[PDB]
Symmetry: C6
Subunit: 29 residues, 6 copies
């Protein structure tokens, strides 16, 4: 349903954010 | 329902945050 | 109910965070 | 119930994080 | 069940993240 | 369910993000 699809979008976005934070961490290091 | 709509709003907001973080990462890099 | 209200609070807080991240992005540019 | 209480904890923590991010934004700016 | 347990894990992790953000804020300040 | 599995993925991703934030904190320190 809509809820399952929306949660999957949230999961995908958080994974993208996690990768971006890793980029930031690497840049700072 | 209200909960489904609110979760969609959360999803949209998180996507906005993700984009902003990408901008920050790019700015820091160069 | 309580769950829907709590999710709305989460949504509002994430929107606040999103705005703050935009401020940070702007500051880092100069 | 347990889910509602856990979501409330999440909401409170996100609000704390939002305040801390504002502190970071302010520090970076000046 | 699984949902409640998973949300508790999320709550714990977010609390850890909140503390780490406070560390970042403190480092930037001083 | 799909919801429970998606939340587990979210939990794992947030843990990764938490570790990355710690890396950022350490770099700044």
């Amino acid at each position: 349903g809509e809820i399952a699809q929306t949660l999957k979008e949230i999961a995908k976005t958080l994974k993208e954010q996690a990768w971006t934070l890793k980029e930031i961490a690497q840049t700072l290091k």
